[PDB]
Amino acid sequence: DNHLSIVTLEEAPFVIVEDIDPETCVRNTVPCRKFVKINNSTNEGMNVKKCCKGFCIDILKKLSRTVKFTYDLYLVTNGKHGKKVNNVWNGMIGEVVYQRAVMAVGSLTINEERSEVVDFSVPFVETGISVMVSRGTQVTGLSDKKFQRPHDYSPPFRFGTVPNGSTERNIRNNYPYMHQYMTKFNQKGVEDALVSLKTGKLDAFIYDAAVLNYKAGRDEGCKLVTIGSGYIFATTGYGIALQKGSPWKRQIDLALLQFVGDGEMEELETLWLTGICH
Amino acid sequence: MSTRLKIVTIHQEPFVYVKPTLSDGTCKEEFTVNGDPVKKVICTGPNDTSPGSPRHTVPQCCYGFCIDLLIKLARTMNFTYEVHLVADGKFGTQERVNKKEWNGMMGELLSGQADMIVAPLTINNERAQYIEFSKPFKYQGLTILVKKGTRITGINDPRLRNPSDKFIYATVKQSSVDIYFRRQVELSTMYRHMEKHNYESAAEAIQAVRDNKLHAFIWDSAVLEFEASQKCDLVTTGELFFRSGFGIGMRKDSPWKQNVSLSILKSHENGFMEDLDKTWVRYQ
Ligand SMILES: N#C[C@@H]1C[C@H]1c1c(C(F)(F)F)sc2nc(Cn3nc(C(F)(F)F)cc3Cl)cc(=O)n12
Ligand SMILES: N[C@@H](CCC(=O)O)C(=O)O
Numbered sequence: 001d002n003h004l005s006i007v008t009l010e011e012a013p014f015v016i017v018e019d020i021d022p023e024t025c026v027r028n029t030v031p032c033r034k035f036v037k038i039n040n041s042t043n044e045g046m047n048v049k050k051c052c053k054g055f056c057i058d059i060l061k062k063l064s065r066t067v068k069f070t071y072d073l074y075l076v077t078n079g080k081h082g083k084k085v086n087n088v089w090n091g092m093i094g095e096v097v098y099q100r101a102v103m104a105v106g107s108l109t110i111n112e113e114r115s116e117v118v119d120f121s122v123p124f125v126e127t128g129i130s131v132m133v134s135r136g137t138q139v140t141g142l143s144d145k146k147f148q149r150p151h152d153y154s155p156p157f158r159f160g161t162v163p164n165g166s167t168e169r170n171i172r173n174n175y176p177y178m179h180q181y182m183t184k185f186n187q188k189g190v191e192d193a194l195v196s197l198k199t200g201k202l203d204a205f206i207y208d209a210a211v212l213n214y215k216a217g218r219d220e221g222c223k224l225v226t227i228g229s230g231y232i233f234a235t236t237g238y239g240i241a242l243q244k245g246s247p248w249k250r251q252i253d254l255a256l257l258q259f260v261g262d263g264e265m266e267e268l269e270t271l272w273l274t275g276i277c278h
Numbered sequence: 279m280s281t282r283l284k285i286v287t288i289h290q291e292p293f294v295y296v297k298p299t300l301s302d303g304t305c306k307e308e309f310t311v312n313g314d315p316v317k318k319v320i321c322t323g324p325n326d327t328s329p330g331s332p333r334h335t336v337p338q339c340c341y342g343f344c345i346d347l348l349i350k351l352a353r354t355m356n357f358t359y360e361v362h363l364v365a366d367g368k369f370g371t372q373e374r375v376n377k378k379e380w381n382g383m384m385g386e387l388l389s390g391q392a393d394m395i396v397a398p399l400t401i402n403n404e405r406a407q408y409i410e411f412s413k414p415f416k417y418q419g420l421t422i423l424v425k426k427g428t429r430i431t432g433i434n435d436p437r438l439r440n441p442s443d444k445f446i447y448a449t450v451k452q453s454s455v456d457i458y459f460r461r462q463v464e465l466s467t468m469y470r471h472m473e474k475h476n477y478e479s480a481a482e483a484i485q486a487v488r489d490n491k492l493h494a495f496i497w498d499s500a501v502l503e504f505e506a507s508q509k510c511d512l513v514t515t516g517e518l519f520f521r522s523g524f525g526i527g528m529r530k531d532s533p534w535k536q537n538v539s540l541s542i543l544k545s546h547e548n549g550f551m552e553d554l555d556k557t558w559v560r561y562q
Contacts, residue, residue, distance in 0.1 A: 110413065112543035122401065123523070126417050128546075170547060234547050235417065257403035260522070261461060 004071045004248075006060070007092050007101035008032060008052060009080055011190075013214055013272045014107040014125075014238070016054040017075065025051040030061065034075040050075070055272040056238070059124060059256075060105050062264065063240075066255040067248070074101075081108055083164045093118055096241045102248065104241040107211065109166035111236060119244050121252050123237020124265070129167055130209040131159075131227045132216060134197060139204060142175075142233045147204075150181050159204035160185025162193065167207055170234050182206075190215065197224055210238065210273075217275020225277075283359040285348060286383045286392035287321065288369065290480060292504050292558045293344040293398045296321065296363065305339040310557055316341050317349055323363030329478065333365055343558040347415060348396045350550065351526075354541045355534065362392075367479055368452040369397075372404060380408065381452055387527055394534070395527030398498060400454035402522070404461070410530050413539040414523030415551060418500040420455060422447075422515045423487055430494065432516030438494070441471035447494035448475040450483060455496055458520055472496075487512055500524070500559065507562050 010017045018029060025031045029051035037045040052073060064071060082093025089097045092104035096118045109127060110120045133139060139146055139157075146157040161167045163186045171179045185202060187193040190211060196202035205212075209232045216225050242249050259265045289296040300306055305318035321340035324333040340361055352359055370384025379385065384405060386392040401411045422430055430437065437445045449455040449472055456476065459469035475492070477483035484505055486492035495502075499518055506514045526542070528535050545551045 110543070112540055112547060115413075115540055115543055120413075122406075122411075123414065123417075126521075174548065233552070234549075235551075236543075236546060237414075237417075253406060254403050257401065257406055260520075261403055261458070263462075263464065 002069050004069050004102040005100065006071045006073050007076050007095040007104045008056070008073055008106045009076050009092055011107040011211065012054065014054050014056040014210075015052060015105075016057075018051040018053070020049050020051055027053075028058070029053045030057055030073060032073040032075055035077050047074075055125070055268055056106050058268050058271070059259070062259060063252060063255055066258070067251045069248070073105075079164065081106070081165050082114055083169075084113065089117060093241060096243055099243060102243065102246070103252075106238075107208065108238055108241055109208065109236055110239040111166050111169065113169070114166075114241070117244070118241040119246055119249055120239035120241055121249065122256050123239050124256050124259075125210050125238040126232070126235065127208055127210040127237055128232035128235040129170060129206060130212040130230065130232055132194075132197065132205040132207065132212050132224055133203065133227060135223055135225045137204065137227075139227055141227055141231060142206070147178050148175060149177070156181075157203045158185055158201075159206060160187050160193070160196075160202060161206045162187050162189055165208070166236075171206070194224065209235075214273055214275065217273075217277050219277055222277035281358070283357050284391065284393045285359050285361045285396050286364055286386045286394070287340065287344060287361060287397045288364050288367065288383060290398050290501060292342055293500075294340060294342045296323070297339045297341075299337050299339055303337060305341075308341075311561065312557070317346060319345055319348070319361050321361040321363055324365060324367075327367055327478070335362075338363070343554050344396050344398065346554055346557070347545075350545065351396075351538065351541055354544075355537050357534070359394075361396075365391075369399060369450070369454060370405070371452045371457055372408075373452075383527065384409065387529065393528075393532075397527075398500060398524045399527050400498070400522050401525045402454055402457060404457050405454075405527075408530075410528045410532060410535045411525035412528070412535070413542050414525050415542050415545070416500060416524040417521065418498055418524070419518030419521035420458070420496060421499040421502050421518055423484065423495040423497060423502045423505065423512055424493065424515050425487055425490070426511055426513050428493065428515065430515040433519045435516075438468060441467060445493050446475050446491075447496065448472055448477060448483060448486075448492055449496045450480050451476045451478055454522070455498075459496075484509075484512070498522075504559055 008015050032050050032052035033047040034050050035045050036048050076092050076095055079090030082091040092108055093114050095101040096104050150156040160182050193205045197205055212226050213230050287294050308316040318339050318341045320337050322335050322337050325336050364383045368382030370380055370382030372378050372380050380388050383395045387395050459465045483495045487495050502514050506512050526538050
């Protein structure tokens with residue numbers, strides 16, 4: 001029981017997906033499969049052989065080596081990270097909960113509701129909630145009355161998130177008014193969100209801190225920034241999700257704390273996360 | 279016949295303040311900047327801090343970021359408790375006696391003297407091997423505390439990387455910073471200089487930087503940044519190296535470990551943890 005089924009999800013620079021070479025996976029990439037449907041009038045599909053690289057993938061490679069396990073990596077096709085719909089978990093969390101995966105590796109936010117259904121490793125990347133705006137935008141943070149009471153402004157401040165992840169869950173639980181106002185500014189993803197910001201179609205984008213900090217540090221012309229000194233609300237971290245009472249957790253926690261201690265972790269941050277903008 | 283949790287803490291401002299009780303055995307009534315009353319607890323502990331001396335246990339007053347967290351955890355999980363300060367005044371390391379033994383709060387927890395560690399206790403591989411840590415209630419790192427004027431680039435400064443009896447730098451004996459410099463061969467030159475000048479407690483080491491006895495003090499940034507914002511004669515130098523978290527310590531068999539972490543997660547998510555940072559750290 002050394003060959004583990006592992007789920008991932010594409011989110012640069014943590015997890016990056018590529019097409020296989022002209023005929024396997026080269027260099028720093030590992031093989032990863034994605035089930036692709038034949039049509040939408042069927043359940044029939046084929047697992048396409050793809051290649052995976054990125055910060056979280058380098059962490060997987062180190063754990064595989066240290067903790068001594070081999071794996072079969074696949075990309076989730078049901079949800080994304082994890083959402084409880086009518087008490088049924090989807091995404092990476094669902095895969096672990098319904099035992100299709102031994103572990104979920106990726107830009108997976110540790111939160112209380114997910115922790116009730118899966119076991120998380122120690123956090124290996126600091127995250128939380130940040131706000132991306134065009135440099136100069138006057139907003140104190142999530143608690144700003146531009147967000148909390150948007151209709152007190154003429155015209156009202158335009159802000160959204162990418163729904164169904166830990167960010168929206170957190171806004172839903174803490175700012176009921178803000179949440180119901182934001183939903184008309186829901187973004188299909190990070191790339192759409194940044195385009196709306198850069199083209200004056202959005203005023204602020206609220207999202208995962210680690211991803212927003214990476215995106216501002218690599219912004220062309222260093223126009224888009226995170227409010228404060230790249231400040232983090234509801235500070236949390238990314239964790240590897242494991243089944244509850246999993247035997248793999250102990251070994252995985254010690255290896256991660258070893259990687260931090262050794263300097264191995266700072267090397268990955270240098271390699272994948274460092275930016276030009278400051 | 280007691281189901282009351284034994285809590286071990288350590289004096290470490292701004293997380294745990296330790297003041298004497300009033301002549302009648304109570305805590306002086308105080309108030310935060312927001313006019314709210316400062317929540318205080320009676321914490322027993324030694325008065326004679328000297329090494330190799332008898333320890334006369336006395337009731338003292340405890341308050342701070344970690345006490346407010348304890349009170350929140352106790353209310354949420356519906357447990358009763360009693361607070362005592364670590365008898366030897368140490369965080370805790372595993373030292374060779376053939377046999378290896380844990381000291382400090384680590385020692386106290388493993389021996390059953392404590393049922394829980396509620397302090398700014400660093401999560402590391404060495405301790406995680408023997409005890410259960412909760413999810414972090416604070417992420418921070420290491421930095422250097424010097425007297426205003428003393429110029430250092432950081433951990434990669436030749437006055438540190440190439441030690442000499444000219445520039446005396448240290449940390450705290452039997453702490454996580456002590457474990458960090460010892461385990462890493464890359465920092466063995468620094469560790470060997472340090473081992474000869476390490477202080478019993480951070481307060482002693484902070485006063486040593488004031489009374490010109492210590493040049494640089496390598497310690498937790500949550501503590502150091504707070505100390506530099508209060509005592510304007512001291513400033514922190516460099517950025518952060520060995521970024522680490524503080525967690526609640528329990529035995530691997532604790533029936534509280536799951537609910538302790540869920541409570542910490544809830545507190546980060548609802549702003550309670552940010553409020554503690556506002557009340558105890560983010561000021562002046
Ligand atoms: N322990 C530990 C790991 C090693 C240290 C660590 C990171 C490291 F880069 F070092 F790998 S990133 C990180 N973020 C948080 C931020 N964080 N995460 C949480 C959460 F897990 F509770 F969500 C709470 C807070 Cl603060 C806490 C934390 O401890 N760490
Ligand atoms: N990392 C987040 C996704 C992005 C977000 O919603 O902030 C999660 O695990 O849900």
